[PDB]
């Protein structure tokens, strides 16, 4: 009994509708969807048990194929909190759950007032170290990894200053190469042409 | 208010060692399950047990063993015959009154080639730039945890002695420092962002705190450096006006 | 108005049991334990109906185990034997040289063990003989039929000899041509 | 027509039968003043999770009989080829309908004898508090027990043929061949119940089940 | 058709 | 052979009143001829009849699905079996052969004891009647009562005290369900 989930990965902007799929050549008697946060236990979303069954849980719509061979999960007006791994599981009327490989869903937040910039930050310690902080870009911007062993670049991360109705992206780059400067740190990323570079 | 638990959260061992993963539940369920999760593989069933004293092989039982002496408990043993032990391991339980499998929180097992590879994180805090302050009226602190192995860390920010989640983003994935090395050391960054006004107050204290899970008080350490035990490493910064 | 009775027993230390259905006092069938088959009293019954012997075998096993339990529970009080009353009688009024059947009717006894012989003149005969299983009674004693087919004559006399533990002497009931 | 073998049925057919007899729709004291397709009755938002419910009959007189009555429903519910009535999800069902007022003073327990290859197995029990009960309801209840205990709708179980007989105190008796599924899909399988055939509860004597192996 | 038998029950122990 | 015996008897009795309109189930456990515990459908639960039956009654009454099964056995078991054997039991008809002959004993000369034997018949309900010259006699009538041969056939002998007279014809009449009008056998 083999379940295939489609697509493996999905990156999508907040506000969009999306569909993910779970397919088999075998018939299932019950089929399930779970959501998982990284390094945590999956949580059941829904179980469907009759062909053609549509279940609606707020923005999510689950459907069981008429011939019991597939299921879809549809999200209306995707939101960043929908980010996670979506696992399909199928039983059969007798003997146990088999899981798919999962669709990894990433929903990117709308960024209201982008102000892309790259800043330099100095070590608290008297030490001579520094990081470069690429920040305040909108979610249309992607950060690439380093193409150099002694330069470290982290992916983008959204922080939420809840009090200030303010969200922002950022990515950190660092090195101890004398070669390395904040001007050049994110050269392998496609960044906005108006990115602010202080002094 | 019953649930499932697993322990410990992080497990680290030298190759050739059998290891126990613990799973308890007090949901009063009869059925219990162990899965392994690997990047891009989903969950694969290792062993299950429909009722106390009974257990039965799953899809991938090779290298694994379970006992089920009590209803509440379902120890998994990962044997030295298991060829690829490193994984995320999940326990689950269910009743016949629902289809639902309830999952425990998972346990991360890393198996090392040998213990010389083990290092706690060095941790440093980098202070906001005066350009970000004038340009945005905000102030981002960056914490860097570097040179750690295994990847078994929990970082948190503490503002004036209280943990904060607002204004915080921590990489969900660490970076490999030396990728062409199987027991590569790791790095992880985190950001904490506050208003410039809040950063400019010299009464405000900021701390990046990294809980590391390393060697136990039983493992043998001989080498020159201090033994890389389970420890908290930190760095701090104070606001300034300047 | 009618009565169907499913009647079973187990006896120790003899280790014999029986299972039978009774309609108004006649046997519909019993199960032969040794051969694990259903035996219909009359042959016609068995194309009209059926019964899987296994079901009786399972019952007899529980009866066995229960008897052991009860025996012990009663501080091993044994049965009091009750001697049978015998009456011999014939299928139909005797007509000289026209095949008839002798009936030995063994009544009102317990436990259900009984040694029965037909004596023609004085010698034992076991040719064409047949019998029934231990049939039930409302008082919980037993009934049993024995059958000797023959040909009526003056040249012969008959004795149904019946032995039972509640009888200090083997019982003899005679039948001579009338 | 002799008992149909399980082996004749598509995997889908078995899964659909499993699904129908394990997840019936059961609701008490609801009412519809709405006929559709002249034969069907509509209960808006009254199905599972607020779905609309379409209860389908063989005849218009059957629907008119329960139209605007306080009814009880007990039947096998499907989605595929359930005709929509609104833009809400619609859930379908044949018959299974009786009057909510018509209840017994005390619960009626009906026994079921069971044999497998002629071998007598444990006696089973079902219940109803309905003075008049659909034949659908009791078939569902028996096949549920049979599904649980005997795995009658699992492809790989040893059960390969099966028959359910309802033995009435009155002259007419009813019978079901458990593998004589009228087709592969729920809407075909479940149509057998459209006549809404209903039994007086006091007149039911008992049920007989005969299952057969490959042996 | 079949004769049904009533099951004998295990006595209290 | 001298060993003490120990006996366990079990009875499940289905009592029918008016076809199958009213059924009664009596289930009885009997140790050494002594009934100890029973289930009676008119009661609906087990009841000890002696103190030896007590542990069984209360263990058995504690199981709700046991009780439930028992209380529906009136249908699943009794009516069921009634129906199964209806053709060859309830509706069994065997016609008696009737014969009249002088008895082969009797006190004490200048008198005659006559014998009417009805044999090989099923079922046991039967009216036997004697006549002297077409007029029935009820005085000096003596009967064996029904005799069950086993084998699903009955027999009975009815005797009549006669002080015999010239010209007389005696008649034995038998009324029975296997015959649509009476059987008569004539003697002189
Ligand atoms: Na359903």
Is C66 in contact with E6 (Cβ distance < 8 A)? no
Distance CA B20, CA D1 (A): 60
The tokens for D65 are 């009989």
Q: Which CATH superfamily is domain A1-109 in?
A: Immunoglobulins (2.60.40.10)
> CA dihedral in degrees (D64, D66, D68, D74; nearest 10)?
-140
How many angstroms separate the CA of residue C122 from the nearest CA in chain F? 25
- Cis status, amide bond into C111, omega within 30 of 0: yes
Would you say domain F1-91 falls under CATH 3.10.320.10? yes
- DSSP result, A14-30: TT--EEEEEE-SS--S-
How would you classify residue C111: left for phi > 0, otherwise alpha for psi between -120 and 50, otherwise beta?
beta
- b vs e for C135-151, b when ≥16 Cβ sit within 10 Å of the residue's Cβ? bbbeebbbbbbbbbebe
Experimental method: X-ray
- Give the three-state DSSP class for F70: helix
Query: What residues contact A7, with CB distance under 8 A and at least 6 apart?
Result: A20, A103
Distance CA B99, CA A46 (A): 10
Q: How many CB atoms lie within 10 A of CB D137?
A: 25
Which chains reach chain B with 3 or more Cβ–Cβ distances below 8 angstroms? A
Q: Which domains does chain D have, with CATH numbers?
A: 1-22+102-213 (3.10.20.120), 23-100 (2.40.50.110)
- Cis status, amide bond into C13, omega within 30 of 0: yes
| Domain parsing of chain F, residue ranges | 1-91, 92-188
Is E4 in contact with D118 (Cβ distance < 8 A)? no
- Cis status, amide bond into F123, omega within 30 of 0: yes
- b vs e for B98-124, b when ≥16 Cβ sit within 10 Å of the residue's Cβ? ebbbbbbebbbbbbbeebeebbbbebb
Query: What residues contact F42, with CB distance under 8 A and at least 6 apart?
Result: F24
CB A139 within 8 A of CB A111: yes
C70 shares its domain with C91: no
CB A94 within 8 A of CB A84: no
In angstroms, how far apart are the furthest CA atoms of chain B? 68
Query: What residues contact A180, with CB distance under 8 A and at least 6 apart?
Result: A151
How many angstroms separate the CA of residue F71 from the nearest CA in chain D? 9
Supply the range of the domain harboring residue C117. 79-178
Instruction: Please state, in angstroms and as integers, the Cα–Cα distance from residue B57 to each residue in B33, B46, B105, C155, following that order.
Output: 10, 7, 22, 83
Distance CA C31, CA C58 (A): 12
CB F27 within 8 A of CB F42: no
- Give the three-state DSSP class for C15: coil
Distance CA C120, CA C143 (A): 24
How many angstroms separate the CA of residue C90 from the nearest CA in chain E? 33
Element (H, E) at D12: helix D11-22
Nearest CA in chain C to F82: C4
Domain count, chain C: 2
The tokens for F80 are 């069921």
CA pseudo-torsion sign C131, C132, C138, C140:
positive
Q: Output DSSP code: residue D193.
A: G
- b vs e for B182-202, b when ≥16 Cβ sit within 10 Å of the residue's Cβ? ebbbbbbbbbbbbbbebbbee
D173 C-alpha vs ligand 1 centroid, how far in Å? 27
Select the residue of C8, C50, C70 nearest E11 (Cβ to Cβ).
C70
The tokens for A193 are 């042409």
In angstroms, how far apart are the furthest CA atoms of chain A? 69
> CA dihedral in degrees (B96, B100, B106, B112; nearest 10)?
80
Judged on CB neighbours under 10 Å (0-12, 13-18, 19+), C169 is: exposed
CB B143 within 8 A of CB B123: yes
Is D23 in contact with A50 (Cβ distance < 8 A)? yes
The tokens for B89 are 């391991």
Nearest CA in chain F to C135: F150
Select the residue of C27, C48, C70 nearest F31 (Cβ to Cβ).
C70
| DSSP-assigned beta bridge partners for residue A70 | A23
Question: Looking up tokens 């014939």, which residue turns up?
Answer: C90
Distance CA B42, CA B40 (A): 6
Q: How far apart are the first and last CA of chain F?
A: 57
Distance CA B126, CA A181 (A): 16
CA D44 to chain centre: 22
Scanning chain C, the segments in alpha helix (DSSP H) are 45-48, 54-73
The tokens for D39 are 């034969």
Query: Chain E interface residues facing chain D, Cβ-Cβ under 8 Å?
Result: 2, 4-5
Distance CA F112, CA F163 (A): 6
CA pseudo-torsion sign F156, F161, F164, F167:
negative
How would you classify residue C71: left for phi > 0, otherwise alpha for psi between -120 and 50, otherwise beta?
alpha
Distance CA C160, CA A102 (A): 88
Residues in chain F: 188
Reference C136, options F6, F33, F4, F146; nearest CA is F33
Which of C25, C56, C78 is a domain's end point?
C78
Distance CA F182, CA F173 (A): 6
Topology match between the domains A1-109 and A110-199: yes
Side-chain-side CA neighbours of residue A79 (13 Å): 4
Instruction: Please state, in angstroms and as integers, the Cα–Cα distance from residue B161 to each residue in A76, B145, B158, following that order.
Output: 41, 20, 5
Q: How many CB atoms lie within 10 A of CB C170?
A: 11
CB D39 within 8 A of CB A53: no
Q: Which residues in chain C have Cβ-Cβ distances shorter than 8 Å to D120?
A: 52, 54-55
- b vs e for F27-39, b when ≥16 Cβ sit within 10 Å of the residue's Cβ? bbbbbbebbbbbb
Q: Output DSSP code: residue C79.
A: P
| Domain parsing of chain B, residue ranges | 1-113, 114-242
CB C116 within 8 A of CB C162: yes
CATH number of the CATH domain containing C16? 3.10.320.10
Side-chain-side CA neighbours of residue C10 (13 Å): 22
> CA dihedral in degrees (B156, B162, B167, B169; nearest 10)?
10
- Give the three-state DSSP class for C55: helix
| DSSP-assigned beta bridge partners for residue B162 | B159
Is E1 in contact with C70 (Cβ distance < 8 A)? no
Would you say domain A110-199 falls under CATH 2.60.40.10? yes
How many angstroms separate the CA of residue D134 from the nearest CA in chain F? 20
Q: Resolution for this model in angstroms, one decimal place?
A: 2.3
How would you classify residue C25: left for phi > 0, otherwise alpha for psi between -120 and 50, otherwise beta?
left
Crossing angle for the helix pair F64-73 and F54-61, nearest 10 degrees?
A: 100
Judged on CB neighbours under 10 Å (0-12, 13-18, 19+), A164 is: middle
Residues in chain B: 242
CB B90 within 8 A of CB B34: yes
CB C67 within 8 A of CB F7: yes
Instruction: Say if C55 is an interface residue toward chain D (CB within 8 Å).
Output: yes
CA C134 to chain centre: 4
Would you say domain B1-113 falls under CATH 2.60.40.10? yes
The tokens for D84 are 């929509």
Reference C137, options C109, C104, C115, C105; nearest CA is C109
| Domain parsing of chain A, residue ranges | 1-109, 110-199
The tokens for B146 are 């570097």
Strands (E), D69-135: 71-75, 77-78, 90-94, 97-99, 103-116, 119-120, 124-130, 132-134
Instruction: Please state, in angstroms and as integers, the Cα–Cα distance from residue D60 to each residue in A173, B39, B216, D56, D78, following that order.
Output: 75, 59, 79, 10, 21
Distance CA D76, CA D55 (A): 10
Nearest CA in chain E to F58: E12
Crossing angle for the helix pair D135-150 and D11-22, nearest 10 degrees?
A: 110
Is C48 in contact with F87 (Cβ distance < 8 A)? yes
- Mind spelling out the 3-state secondary structure of chain B? CCCEEEECCEEEEECCCCEEEEEEECCCCCEEEEEEEECCCEEEEEEEEEECCEEEECCCCCCEEECCCCCCECCEEECCCCCCCCEEEEEEEECCCCCCCEECCCEEEEEECCHHHCECCEEEEEECCHHHHHHHCEEEEEEEEEEEECCCEEEEEEECCEEECCCEEECCCCEECCCCCCCCCEEEEEEEEEEHHHHCCCCCEEEEEEEECCECCCCCCCCCCCCCECEEEEEEEECCCC
Q: Which residues in chain B have Cβ-Cβ distances shorter than 8 Å to A32?
A: 99
Distance CA E2, CA C53 (A): 11
Q: Which CATH superfamily is domain F92-188 in?
A: Immunoglobulins (2.60.40.10)
How would you classify residue F64: left for phi > 0, otherwise alpha for psi between -120 and 50, otherwise beta?
alpha
Is F30 in contact with C140 (Cβ distance < 8 A)? yes
Question: Looking up tokens 């295994």, which residue turns up?
Answer: B150
The tokens for D21 are 């007899």
Side-chain-side CA neighbours of residue A123 (13 Å): 14
Query: What residues contact A19, with CB distance under 8 A and at least 6 apart?
Result: A72, A73, A74, A75
C73 shares its domain with C83: no
Q: Which residues in chain A have Cβ-Cβ distances shorter than 8 Å to D23?
A: 49-50
CB D135 within 8 A of CB D197: yes
Is A102 in contact with B42 (Cβ distance < 8 A)? yes
CA pseudo-torsion sign F159, F160, F162, F164:
negative
Topology match between the domains B1-113 and B114-242: yes
Instruction: Please state, in angstroms and as integers, the Cα–Cα distance from residue C177 to each residue in A52, C95, C128, D126, following that order.
Output: 88, 9, 20, 63
- Cis status, amide bond into F108, omega within 30 of 0: yes
Distance CA A141, CA A169 (A): 9
- Cis status, amide bond into F84, omega within 30 of 0: no
Distance CA D171, CA B209 (A): 84
C71 shares its domain with C84: no
B114-242, which class in CATH? mainly beta
């Amino acid at each position: 009994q083999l379940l295939e989930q489609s697509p493996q990965f999905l990156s999508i902007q907040e506000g969009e509708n999306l569909t993910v799929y779970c397919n088999s050549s075998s018939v299932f008697s019950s089929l399930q969807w779970y959501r998982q946060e990284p390094g945590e236990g999956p949580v059941l979303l829904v179980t469907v048990v009759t062909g053609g069954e549509v279940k609606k849980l707020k923005r999510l719509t689950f459907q069981f194929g008429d011939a019991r061979k597939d299921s879809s999960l549809h999200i209306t007006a995707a939101q960043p909190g929908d980010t996670g791994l979506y696992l399909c599981a199928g039983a059969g009327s007798q003997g146990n759950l088999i899981f798919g490989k999962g669709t990894k869903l990433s929903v990117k937040p709308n960024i209201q007032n982008p102000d892309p910039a790259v800043y330099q930050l100095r070590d608290s310690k008297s030490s001579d170290k520094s990081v470069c902080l690429f920040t305040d870009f909108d979610s249309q911007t992607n950060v690439s990894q380093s193409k150099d062993s002694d330069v470290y670049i982290t992916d983008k991360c959204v922080l939420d200053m809840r009090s200030m109705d303010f969200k922002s992206n950022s990515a950190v780059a660092w090195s101890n190469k004398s070669d390395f400067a904040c001007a050049n740190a994110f050269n392998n990323s496609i960044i906005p042409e108006d990115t602010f570079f202080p002094s | 208010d019953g649930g499932i638990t697993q322990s410990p959260k992080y497990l680290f061992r030298k190759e050739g060692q059998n290891v126990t993963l613990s799973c308890e539940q007090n949901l009063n369920h009869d059925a219990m399950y162990w899965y392994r999760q690997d990047p891009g593989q989903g969950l694969r069933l290792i062993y299950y047990s429909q009722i106390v004293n009974d257990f039965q092989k799953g899809d991938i039982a090779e290298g694994y063993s379970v006992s089920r002496e009590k209803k509440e408990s379902f120890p998994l043993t990962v044997t030295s015959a298991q060829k690829n032990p490193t994984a995320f391991y999940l326990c689950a339980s269910s009743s016949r009154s629902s289809y639902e499998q309830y999952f425990g929180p998972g346990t991360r097992l890393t198996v090392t080639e040998d213990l010389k590879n083990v290092f706690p994180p060095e941790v440093a805090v980098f202070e906001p730039s005066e350009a970000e302050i004038s340009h945005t009226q905000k102030a981002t602190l960056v914490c860097l945890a570097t040179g750690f192995y295994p990847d078994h860390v929990e970082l948190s920010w503490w503002v004036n002695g209280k943990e904060v989640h607002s204004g915080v983003c921590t990489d969900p994935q660490p970076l490999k420092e030396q990728p062409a090395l199987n027991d590569s050391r790791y790095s992880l960054s985190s950001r904490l962002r506050v208003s410039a006004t809040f950063w400019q107050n010299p009464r405000n204290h900021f701390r990046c705190q990294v809980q590391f899970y390393g060697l136990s008080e039983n493992d043998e350490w001989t080498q020159d450096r201090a033994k890389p035990v389970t420890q908290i490493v930190s760095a701090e910064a104070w606001g300034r006006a300047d | 108005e009618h009565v169907i009775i499913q009647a079973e027993f187990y006896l120790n230390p003899d280790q014999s049991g029986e299972f039978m259905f009774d309609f108004d006092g006649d046997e519909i069938f019993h199960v032969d334990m040794a051969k694990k088959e259903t035996v219909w009293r009359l042959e016609e019954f068995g194309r009209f109906a059926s019964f899987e012997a296994q079901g009786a075998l399972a019952n007899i096993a529980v009866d066995k185990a229960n008897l052991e339990i009860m025996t012990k529970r009663s501080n091993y009080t044994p049965i009091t034997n009750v001697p049978p009353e015998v009456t011999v009688l014939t299928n139909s009024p005797v007509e000289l040289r026209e095949p008839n059947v002798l009936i030995c009717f063994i009544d009102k006894f317990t436990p259900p063990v009984v040694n029965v012989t037909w004596l023609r003149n004085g010698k034992p005969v076991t040719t064409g003989v047949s019998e029934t299983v231990f049939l039930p009674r409302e008082d919980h004693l037993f009934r049993k039929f024995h059958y000797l087919p023959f040909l009526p004559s003056t040249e012969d006399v008959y004795d149904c000899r019946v032995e039972h533990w509640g009888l200090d002497e083997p019982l003899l009931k005679h039948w001579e041509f009338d | 027509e002799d008992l149909h073998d399980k082996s004749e049925l598509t995997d889908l057919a078995l899964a659909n039968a499993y699904g129908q007899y394990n997840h019936p729709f059961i609701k008490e004291n609801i009412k519809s003043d709405e006929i559709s397709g002249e034969k069907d009755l509509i209960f808006r938002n009254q199905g599972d999770s607020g779905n609309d419910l379409r209860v389908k009959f063989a005849t218009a007189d059957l629907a008119q009989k329960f139209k605007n009555k306080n009814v009880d429903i007990y039947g096998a519910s499907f989605y595929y080829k359930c005709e929509k009535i609104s833009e809400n999800i619609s859930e379908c069902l044949y018959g299974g309908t009786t009057l909510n007022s018509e209840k017994l003073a005390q619960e009626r327990v009906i026994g079921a004898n069971v044999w497998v290859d002629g071998i007598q197995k444990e006696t089973e029990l079902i219940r109803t508090n309905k003075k008049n009960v659909t034949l659908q309801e009791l078939d569902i209840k028996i096949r549920k027990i049979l599904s649980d205990k005997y795995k009658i709708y699992y492809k790989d179980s040893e059960i390969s043929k099966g028959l359910i007989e309802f033995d009435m105190k009155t002259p007419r008796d009813y019978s079901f061949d458990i593998y004589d599924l009228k087709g592969e899909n729920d809407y075909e399988i479940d149509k057998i119940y459209e006549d809404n055939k209903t039994l007086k509860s006091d007149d039911i004597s008992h049920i007989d089940v005969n299952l057969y192996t490959k042996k | 058709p079949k004769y049904v038998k009533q099951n004998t029950l295990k006595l209290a122990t | 052979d001298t060993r003490p015996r120990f006996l366990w008897q079990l009875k499940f009795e289905c009592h029918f009143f008016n076809g199958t309109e009213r059924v009664r189930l009596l289930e009885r456990c009997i140790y050494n001829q002594e009934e100890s515990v029973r289930f009676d459908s008119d009661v609906g639960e087990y009841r000890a009849v002696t103190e030896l039956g007590r542990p069984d009654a209360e263990y058995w009454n504690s199981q709700k699905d046991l009780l439930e099964q028992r209380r529906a056995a009136v249908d699943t078991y009794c009516r069921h079996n009634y129906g199964v054997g209806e053709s060859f039991t309830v509706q069994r008809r065997v016609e008696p052969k009737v014969t009249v002959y002088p008895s082969k004993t009797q006190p004490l000369q200048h008198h005659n004891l006559l014998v009417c034997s009805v044999s090989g018949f099923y079922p046991g309900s039967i009216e036997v009647r004697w006549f002297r010259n077409g007029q029935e006699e009820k005085a000096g009538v003596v009967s064996t009562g029904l005799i069950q041969n086993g084998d699903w056939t009955f027999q009975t002998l009815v005797m009549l005290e006669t002080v015999p007279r010239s010209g007389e014809v005696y008649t034995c009449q038998v009324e029975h369900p296997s015959v649509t009008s009476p059987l008569t056998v004539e003697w002189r």
